[PDB]
């Protein structure tokens, strides 16, 4: 059934699984019309599909042309997400196809289940965790490739850079979700923390900076301060 705190180590076992997050698929700016009415303008989006064990990110870019002439876009976006996930699975070799797919929002269950009827042995699961994957567009290089797309495109990343050389996938996922939770609660502060020291760079082939183990503990600590901070600035505590 649903994925929660109690079965959390299941993410890092050897059964292939994927998280699918659809928050950033349908993205709009809301603005005023010359006549003083309101209108939306779509911008490029992305499906965030992630193997939590390996760090492999299948970033399907959703170009605004896919909404042209379509109605009820928020609903369509869930079915479009499900169509693209199903296409991704069929494109993988059998031994690489996931055994489970965990959706971060329950409204993706039925669309994905229907698109995956051909794969009755792939379990489609919800989760009770409040995962911060919406903040993926606060990662500069991911945001940059989505916004520059002129056509539908799939781009492959490792969201853990080279971390798994030094840490386990449980620890790497915990670092990722802490970075993303921080970027989500206070993006400016989060990014200040990450780039404050000009001597620590982001390698061309990476998404995050090249921190030593000690600098990662400093960084991780600063992000927890931010999240507690903002949690006080918010609730006044």
């Amino acid at each position: 059934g649903a994925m929660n705190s109690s079965n959390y180590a299941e993410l890092f076992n050897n059964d292939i699984k994927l998280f699918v997050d659809d928050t950033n698929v349908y993205r709009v700016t809301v603005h005023k019309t010359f006549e003083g009415n309101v209108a939306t303008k779509a911008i490029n989006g992305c499906i965030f599909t992630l193997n939590p064990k390996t760090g492999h990110l299948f970033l399907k870019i959703i170009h605004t042309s896919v909404w042209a002439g379509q109605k009820r876009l928020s609903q369509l976006a869930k079915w479009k997400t499900a169509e693209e996930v199903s296409a991704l699975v069929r494109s993988l070799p059998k031994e690489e196809q996931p055994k489970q797919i965990i959706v971060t929002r329950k409204a993706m269950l039925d669309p994905l289940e229907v698109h995956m009827l051909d794969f009755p042995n792939i379990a489609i699961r919800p989760t009770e965790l409040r995962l911060p994957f919406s903040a993926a567009m606060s990662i500069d290089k991911l945001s940059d490739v989505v916004m520059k797309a002129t056509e539908p495109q799939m781009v492959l990343f490792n969201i853990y850079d080279d971390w798994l050389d030094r840490i386990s996938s449980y620890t790497a996922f915990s670092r990722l979700t802490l970075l993303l939770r921080a970027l989500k609660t206070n993006e400016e502060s989060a990014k200040m923390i990450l780039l404050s020291d000009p001597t620590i760079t982001i390698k061309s082939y990476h998404l995050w900076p090249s921190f030593t183990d000690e600098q990662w503990i400093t960084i991780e600590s600063q992000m927890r301060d931010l999240i507690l901070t903002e949690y006080g600035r918010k609730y006044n505590v």
């Binding site: 079915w79 169509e83 229907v114 009827l117």
Partner: protein
């Protein structure tokens, strides 16, 4: 007007004849039911006084033979049987009638209730849902499970209703995933009506038979089937206008007959609220919506 005689009534039992029911005491001098309208299927059903568990019964059509009831003390139930000797049967019934030991099927002349509940129900289709080919009549009880229930265990005693499943490859055309899930018209009209049922009469017949088993015997899988068949119509954007009009009439009389006490367990809140207020056909069931709102406004 046909007759279903009883050999005897050795055990105290509540006897039902379609919507009507009466009580028979242990070893009371009861020899059956007379004046049964020809032209309709019927159901004779029972509930033992001692064990209200297992309401059961027999679907039958007097045009297809001479039937009677006889208690079996070994299997512990009232059994329907066929009498093949026509002169024996006439002589039995005439004696019991002459001694006035039969209740009269108590139909009010104005009353079309049974016709309206069984309009599309045929014995030949009942006998393909309930498979026991050596008898002309069909046994149903509270506990029997459906083919689809068994997929999710004795196959000989199953209710073989038409499997309906909205998240199935039968229901969803490759490449029409969102279209077909949100508008079930292709599943209703092509797959089910044209392909499986052949016409809307056979569809409505199964729907009506499922409701009647659900209401009379509290058969849970029958209730699931009745709701699925309603929901498939209501969730279709394109339904023949005559089907919608007939559906409204069908459901109206089901809700009108369904005793007030059974609604708790039988009616599925989600299906009814979706059908009357959210679905494509939300505006097409005027009679059904009016009686639902005036009888069961709590459900909604």
């Amino acid at each position: 007007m046909n007759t279903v005689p009883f050999t005897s009534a050795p055990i105290e039992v509540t006897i039902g004849i379609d919507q009507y029911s009466f009580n028979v005491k242990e070893n009371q001098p009861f020899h059956g039911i007379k004046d049964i309208p020809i032209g309709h299927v019927h159901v004779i059903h029972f509930q033992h006084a001692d064990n209200s568990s297992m309401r059961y019964g027999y679907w039958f059509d007097c045009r297809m033979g001479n039937f009677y009831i006889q208690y079996d003390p070994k299997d512990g139930l009232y059994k329907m049987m066929e009498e093949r000797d026509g002169a024996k049967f006439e002589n039995i019934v005439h004696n019991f009638k002459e001694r006035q030991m039969m209740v009269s099927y108590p139909k009010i002349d104005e009353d079309d209730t049974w016709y309206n509940l069984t309009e599309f129900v045929q014995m030949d289709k009942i006998r393909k849902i309930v498979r026991k080919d050596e008898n002309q009549f069909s046994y149903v009880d509270s506990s029997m499970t459906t083919v689809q229930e068994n997929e999710l265990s004795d196959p000989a005693h199953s209710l073989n209703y038409t499997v309906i499943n909205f998240k199935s490859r039968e229901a969803i055309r490759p490449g029409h995933e969102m279209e077909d899930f949100l508008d079930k018209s292709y599943y209703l009209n092509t797959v089910m009506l044209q392909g499986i049922f052949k016409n809307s009469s056979n569809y409505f017949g199964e729907l009506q038979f499922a409701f009647l088993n659900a209401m009379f015997f509290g058969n849970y899988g029958s209730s699931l089937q009745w709701h699925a068949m309603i929901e498939l119509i209501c969730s279709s954007a394109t339904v023949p206008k005559h089907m919608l009009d007939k559906l409204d009439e069908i459901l109206y009389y089901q809700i009108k007959t369904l005793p007030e006490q059974y609604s708790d367990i039988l009616l599925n809140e989600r299906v009814w609220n979706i059908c009357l207020y959210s679905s494509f056909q939300k505006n097409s069931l005027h009679n059904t919506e009016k009686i639902m709102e005036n009888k069961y406004p709590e459900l909604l």
